[PDB]
Amino acid sequence: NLVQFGFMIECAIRNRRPALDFMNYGCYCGTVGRGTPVDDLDRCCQVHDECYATAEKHGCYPSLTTYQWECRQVGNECNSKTQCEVFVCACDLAAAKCLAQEDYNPAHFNINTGERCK
């Protein structure tokens, strides 16, 4: 579910930033969900939305599915059981690893989405 996604982000970035910093970034990270991503970090969110769109086609409800995962010494891992749980955990794990690796440009926090996201 989305709270676990938050936890994944904190795990991946070793609590460097609150998960909330990734909920107002660019055109896709917690903002409008359309336009050209402003950078590769924003594109992580666009990809995560596409992964959830697939999960919905599979008959899952990704924002609501509660999965099993682990925050390890060296990274995170999914260890989930149902088909939906496996898939949604995978979508969240890929997005959290993506967000943790891409460059976080502070000028891309809280952007003008009216102007930049058409």
Domain map of the chain by residue range?
1-118
Pick the catalytic residue: 48, 49, 58, 108?
Answer: 48
**Domain covering 1-118, topology:** Phospholipase A2 (1.20.90)
Answer for the pair 29, 23: CB distance below 8 angstroms, yes or no.
Answer: yes
Tokens of 79: 């260890």
22 vs 42, 56, 60, 62, 68, CA distance in Å?
A: 9, 23, 24, 18, 22
**φ and ψ at residue 89, rounded to 5 degrees:** -60, -45
- Output the CA–CA distances (angstroms, integers) from residue 17 to 6, 33, 56, 96, 109, in the order listed: 11, 22, 30, 13, 12
Q: How far apart are the first and last CA of the chain?
A: 29
Q: How was this structure determined?
A: X-ray
Residue 60, judged by CB atoms within 10 A of its CB (0-12, 13-18, 19+), counts as buried
Catalytic residue status for 58: no
Catalytic: which of 49, 92, 103, 108? 92
| Residue 40 falls in the annotated catalytic set | no
Maximum CA extent, the chain: 43
